């Protein structure tokens, strides 16, 4: 009955008054109408969405918040219609070409603690839920109809602007012709068809949310949850992102009998962590400006690890990366830096990989033993939904724009190891399989950890400690051969450091002087990467040229004196590696040019790798 419409009208009015009257601030300072202002600015920017806080709504009127929690689908459309009303009365009058009012997408976020995927039980169907997870898959963006009109084939009787329910629910066309008499013929069994030119459609996307790795019960595989995203939530996330989803737990509505497939209709996405606030921005300018930023960054790399300062410095250079370039003839030059740690056990190589995977803005960790050629670069497979061959990205594709941390790098098969040569140097993956022929991007650094052929370095063996090929070894900018040095005072300091490190686990995780928190250094690396690409200065290039020639002559004479080829070759890629390291050092400081000081530091780091060769 129409009393339901009366209830709808008053509830929409209350949502409208929330969006019209809500303020933040104090009378001592001043007030701002938060959601009016956001609506005005977003509409003028052409954004047509706002994000409402559940706690703000609950403070204004707790009954509305309770209604949204219990019955989100029913009341969110009232909230969105109220948002459309407020947008109209906030933006009227509008210039020519903007007269027609647009629909507003209202997103939701809350401060409430989230539930797990395994907390989602049948008691919570159709309720508003908040859960964390990882995006592991994301479909192409496609069209979902929000309004249709259907015409009858016999009499051309038309039903106009049928409201399509949101989500993965469809619509049932009327079984018999509507509102007119049962004439001759009465009805063909599907009398209606959807008119082609009148449909209004919105973007939608399907994603797979995997359970967080630390939420999984012991011995069980991580669970998956399907996500339906809509309008501006499409392409807001990609696979590999950690998210907190706010959405409606629901069944699809077009193994067992009464079985229904469930999914979450996403209403808000909080990427846990393409934008920096101006305060973060100016703080990053300050951090780049201070004179010992290189030392501060290096001390921030793996602070729980005693020693290894040159290795941490090289890892910082790898994190920031060089500058990618395209030359006038179309040829590309790699910008990313590849680093191999090779040697004795118990030297924190795996801990450095686990740090870099967490500190890099884009980062994936994989074991060399647990990987394959297809799973690293890219795989080809048929889809059960449509019998055609599709591509699925591997580690290199998932880490494109970041770092692949390949632990146990000596353990992978040689046939699997030769897969990553193109992706390491050319930063591309050329696939020609099952008729599909393409070249994907894999612009990512490789940080590799490996052991000696004999476990420890076993210094008498020399070049026999390495089974890697010169081809793969020349693709590494730096090859840190790491040897566990038995010195008594070093061991005492290291043991006291480890014991204090284990002791201090209960100390409430207090802030520390003289270093950057990981969450801040991650953002700073992203900012410098997107903002600054340096170049060599002329005199710096002259210095680098002469030093390179000297190093090449030294390597040739060492190999001649040995009458045997060294496993590590000194090549033009090593020249360009020095160039990349200098550019990374300058990019830490946001300087457009690399100086002789930067080239000297790059050569100092590289001469550890040349020590490792000779």
């Amino acid at each position: 009955a129409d009393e339901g419409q009366a209830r709808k009208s008053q509830l929409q009015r209350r949502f409208k008054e929330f969006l019209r009257q809500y303020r933040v601030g104090t009378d001592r300072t001043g007030f701002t109408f938060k959601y009016r202002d956001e609506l005005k600015r977003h509409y003028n920017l052409g954004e047509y969405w706002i994000e409402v806080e559940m706690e703000d709504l609950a403070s204004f009127d707790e009954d509305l918040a309770d209604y949204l929690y219990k019955q989100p689908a029913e009341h969110l459309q009232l909230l969105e219609e109220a948002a459309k009303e407020v947008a109209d009365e906030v933006t009227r009058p509008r210039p020519s070409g903007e007269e027609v009012l647009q629909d507003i997408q209202v997103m939701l976020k809350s401060d409430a603690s989230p539930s797990s995927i395994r907390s989602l039980k049948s008691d919570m169907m159709s309720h508003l839920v908040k859960i964390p997870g990882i995006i592991i898959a994301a479909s192409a963006v496609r069209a979902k109809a929000t309004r249709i009109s259907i015409q009858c084939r016999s009499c051309r009787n038309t039903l106009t602007n049928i409201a399509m329910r949101p989500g993965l629910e469809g619509y049932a066309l009327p079984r018999k012709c509507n509102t007119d008499q049962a004439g001759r013929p009465k009805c063909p069994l599907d009398p209606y068809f959807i008119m082609p030119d009148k449909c209004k459609c919105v973007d939608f996307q399907t994603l797979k949310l995997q359970e967080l790795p630390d939420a999984v019960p012991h011995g069980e595989m991580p669970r998956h949850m399907q996500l339906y995203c809509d309008r501006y939530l499409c392409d807001k996330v990609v696979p590999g992102n950690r998210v907190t989803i706010m959405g409606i737990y629901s069944i699809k509505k077009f193994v067992g009998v009464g079985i229904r497939s469930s999914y979450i209709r996403v209403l808000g996405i909080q990427v846990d962590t393409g934008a920096v606030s101006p305060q973060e921005e100016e703080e990053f300018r300050r951090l780049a400006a201070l004179p010992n930023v290189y030392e501060v960054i290096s001390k921030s790399i793996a602070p729980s690890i005693f020693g290894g300062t040159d290795m941490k410095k090289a890892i910082a250079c790898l994190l920031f990366g060089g500058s990618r370039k395209r030359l006038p003839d179309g040829l590309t030059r790699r910008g990313d830096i590849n680093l191999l740690m090779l040697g004795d056990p118990g030297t924190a190589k795996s801990q450095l990989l686990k740090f870099v995977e967490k500190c890099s803005p884009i980062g994936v960790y994989t074991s060399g033993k647990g990987s394959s050629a297809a799973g690293l670069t890219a795989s080809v497979m048929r889809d059960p939904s449509s019998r055609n061959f599709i591509m699925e990205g591997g580690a290199m594709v998932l880490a494109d724009g970041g770092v692949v941390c390949i632990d146990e790098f000596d353990k992978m098969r040689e046939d699997d190891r030769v897969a990553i040569h193109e992706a390491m140097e050319q930063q591309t993956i050329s696939i020609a399989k099952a008729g599909i022929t393409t070249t994907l991007n894999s612009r990512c650094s490789v940080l590799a950890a490996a052991n000696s052929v004999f476990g420890r370095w076993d210094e008498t063996k020399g070049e026999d400690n390495i089974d890697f090929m010169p081809t793969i070894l020349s693709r590494f900018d730096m090859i840190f051969i790491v040897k566990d040095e038995h010195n008594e005072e070093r061991d005492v300091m290291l043991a006291k450091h480890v014991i204090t490190l284990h002791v201090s686990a209960l100390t409430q995780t207090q802030a520390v002087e003289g270093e950057i928190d990981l969450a801040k250094l991650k953002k700073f690396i992203a900012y410098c990467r997107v903002k600054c690409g340096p170049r060599l200065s002329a005199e710096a290039a002259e210095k680098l040229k002469n030093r390179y020639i000297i190093m090449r002559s030294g390597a040739r004479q060492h190999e001649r004196d040995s009458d045997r080829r060294s496993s590590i070759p000194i090549t033009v890629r090593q020249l360009e590696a020095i160039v990349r390291i200098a550019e990374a050092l300058s990019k830490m400081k946001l300087q457009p040019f690399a100086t002789e000081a930067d080239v000297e530091e790059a050569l100092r780091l590289f001469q550890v790798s040349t020590l490792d060769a000779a």
Partner: protein, 703 residues
């Protein structure tokens, strides 16, 4: 409804309709309510008051009733239960809800239904032996879960919107047999495309599992039989693929046209409607522990000789090998994982390697750990693979997309992986466990899957030296054939030798023959019963968490520094940095054995002793004695300190005599707490005061 004095006289009915009619239904209801209210155990304790209170403490919505107790206390309910299980379980659920809301009037806010589960039903059946005679009866079966759906929502009481008007169709009950078709709207008679009202519909959790006969119960070269089972409501995720379970449920049949056209005869599909799932692995969970059990555990922890008792309880049928029993006890109880600053994870599990001669009970130790531990995986040599150990990718059996699957190390994620014939493995299979041993994870990048699984297990391996005989002429590194990265991943590294020694041989022979007498089909300190040990272990692992306040850093730091020096000297074993963290882990494990919430120097000295003795054991014969005196004189084998308490006692007695001439135990213990010598029980058991003619009594407190 008059009370029915005899339910047993069916008066010609069958049990189903007899209990379906109102009179016997109310009589059964009252009898089950009275049973729950008045049933008491052998000690007179009301067991169901405790069980319902625990259920309401933990919001668990399910009540396990022991069929043995039901049969003993109320006979006719046990009589009718397997004959008409659906009906009587419904009545039991109603009665249990009445009792639960009598005990906790506000529990309706948490639940609206209590599921009565039945355990220890004597009607055990083999899957290969189920017949039509078991249909619609409560059966009990065993098997390995080989398939599981995801937890799916299923309609239970469904409501439909009318396809034209605004009316909603009445509640229709879902049956597990067929789709419920709404019929026609009673307001207007329309029967068109009806749709589910999601908001007004009641759902229930659904999970369909496939169980088959356990591979050790099937004959060799023979294919296993299997059954589908439906898990509903809070029974979902009672098991995972690979779990050995006992399954109590209703054996149910319904018509299937697909089977009819497959066979050419009117064959009916069958399924088990599960009522109770019990993993044969977890015979005792932490939730199963009663106040009697935890009182036993906590009081037993106060023995103050409990460490020796726990060590002796490790494989009580093995003579000697006290160091092996110590190391296995420490590994079995385990340390604590830590993550200072959220950016540096270090494992809490202790890894053990038993290397040595044939016929030295290494495999028997491994099988004991398998039997005693929950979540034990046993594997051997060539029988293992890299892929099978860690994780494996396969086409999904029905839908054929690539899916990742759990290997042994993942399946043992909070348990023990036991690797017998460890040196006999392939290098490619043996290198797979490095990430799981140290980083406690398995990272797979295969066929579009790129993810890391948790593998936080403890690895206990057994191996032989080169040639199958340990050589004291050589060090461990010189006769093991393993390499440094895998050797360093084992915290405790044991060498077991079978050298001739006639007195020990005689005692070992007497112990072995006595064992063969004791176990026919029919050290000093005494062990625990193994049931009590299992309860003690799970309590110590789950309800107790040690925390390290201090460990006297100078002692361990100097120890590690010169242990590194001697390891570099002899080459016997690499020491890296992992041995330090092994010290912390072993200290936490000993604290957990003593149920300490905080680690102490007793635990630290225990860990120090284990490390130093094993490192000494790695040496050659001549080198071993020099190493023994080196680490014994300079570093800490803190056996006892009786002399300080002796002269404190003598000083206090001399002062008291001088005071009186011209409560001593309280005086003594006051001084013993003032000085850092707090372990005074050792002094009270030692001879040093006794031959000086002092004595003690906890009541009189005179000495």
């Amino acid at each position: 409804i008059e009370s029915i004095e005899n339910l047993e006289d069916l008066k010609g009915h069958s049990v189903r309709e007899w209990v379906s009619m109102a009179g016997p239904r109310l009589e059964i209801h009252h009898r089950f309510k009275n049973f729950l209210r008045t049933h008491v155990d052998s000690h007179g304790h009301n067991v169901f008051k405790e069980r319902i209170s625990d259920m309401c403490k933990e919001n668990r919505e399910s009540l396990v009733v022991n069929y043995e107790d039901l049969a003993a206390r109320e006979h006719v309910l046990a009589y009718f239960l397997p004959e008409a299980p659906a009906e009587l379980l419904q009545i039991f659920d109603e009665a249990a809800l009445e009792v639960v809301l009598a005990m906790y009037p506000k529990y309706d806010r948490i639940t609206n239904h209590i599921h009565v589960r039945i355990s220890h039903l004597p009607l055990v059946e083999e899957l290969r032996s189920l017949r039509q005679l078991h249909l619609n009866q409560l059966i009990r079966t065993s098997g390995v879960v080989t398939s599981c759906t995801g937890v799916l929502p299923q309609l239970s009481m469904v409501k439909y919107n009318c396809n034209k008007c605004n009316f909603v169709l009445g509640p229709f009950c879902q049956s597990q047999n067929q789709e419920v078709k709404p019929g026609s709207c009673p307001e207007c008679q329309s029967a068109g495309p009806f749709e589910v009202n999601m908001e007004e519909t009641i759902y229930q959790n659904y999970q369909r599992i496939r169980i088959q006969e356990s591979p050790g119960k099937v004959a060799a070269g023979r294919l296993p039989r299997s059954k589908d089972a439906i898990l509903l409501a809070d029974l979902v995720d009672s098991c995972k693929p690979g779990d050995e379970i006992e399954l109590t449920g209703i054996y149910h049949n319904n018509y299937d046209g697909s089977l009819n056209t497959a066979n050419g005869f009117p064959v009916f599909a069958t399924v088990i409607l599960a009522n109770h799932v019990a993993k044969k692995d977890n015979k005792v969970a932490v939730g199963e522990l009663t106040d009697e059990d935890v009182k036993m555990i906590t009081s037993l922890s106060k023995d103050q000789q409990i460490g020796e008792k726990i060590f002796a309880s490790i494989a009580p049928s093995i003579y000697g090998h006290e160091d092996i029993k110590r190391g296995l006890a420490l590994a079995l109880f385990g340390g604590e994982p830590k993550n200072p600053g959220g950016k540096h994870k270090v494992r809490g599990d202790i890894n053990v390697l038993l290397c040595g001669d044939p016929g030295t009970a290494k495999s028997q130790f491994l099988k004991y750990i398998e039997k005693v531990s929950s979540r034990a995986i046993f594997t051997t040599g060539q029988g293992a693979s890299a892929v099978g150990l860690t994780a494996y990718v396969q086409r999904h059996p029905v839908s054929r997309e690539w899916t990742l699957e759990a290997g042994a190390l993942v399946l043992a994620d909070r348990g023990v992986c036991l690797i017998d014939e460890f040196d006999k493995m392939n290098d490619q299979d043996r290198t797979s466990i490095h990430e799981a041993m140290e980083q406690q994870s398995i990272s797979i990048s295969k066929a579009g899957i790129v993810t890391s699984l948790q593998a936080r297990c403890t690895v206990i391996a057994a191996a032989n030296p080169i040639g199958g005989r340990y050589d004291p002429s050589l060090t461990f590194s010189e006769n093991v054939d393993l390499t440094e990265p895998i050797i360093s991943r084992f915290d405790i590294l044991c060498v077991v030798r079978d050298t001739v020694d006639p007195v020990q041989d005689e005692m070992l022979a007497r112990f072995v023959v006595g064992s063969h007498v004791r176990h026919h089909p029919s050290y000093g300190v005494e062990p625990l019963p193994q049931e009590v040990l299992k309860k003690y272990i799970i309590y110590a692992k789950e309800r107790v968490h040690p925390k390290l306040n201090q460990m006297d850093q100078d002692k361990v730091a100097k120890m590690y520094s010169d242990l590194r020096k001697e390891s570099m000297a002899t080459g016997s074993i690499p020491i890296t940095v992992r041995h330090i963290e092994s010290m912390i882990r072993m200290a936490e494990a000993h604290a957990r054995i003593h149920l300490r919430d905080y680690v102490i120097e007793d635990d630290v000295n225990m860990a120090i002793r284990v490390m130093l003795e094993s490192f000494i054991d790695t040496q050659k014969f001549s080198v071993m004695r020099s190493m023994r005196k080196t680490f014994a004189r300079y570093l800490s084998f803190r056996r006892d300190n009786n002399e300080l308490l002796l002269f404190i006692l003598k000083q206090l007695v001399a002062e008291q005599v001088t005071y009186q001439r011209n409560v001593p135990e309280k005086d003594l213990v006051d001084k013993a707490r003032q000085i850092n010598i707090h372990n005074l029980s050792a002094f009270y058991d030692s001879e040093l005061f006794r031959m000086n003619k002092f004595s003690h009594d906890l009541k009189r407190k005179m000495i």
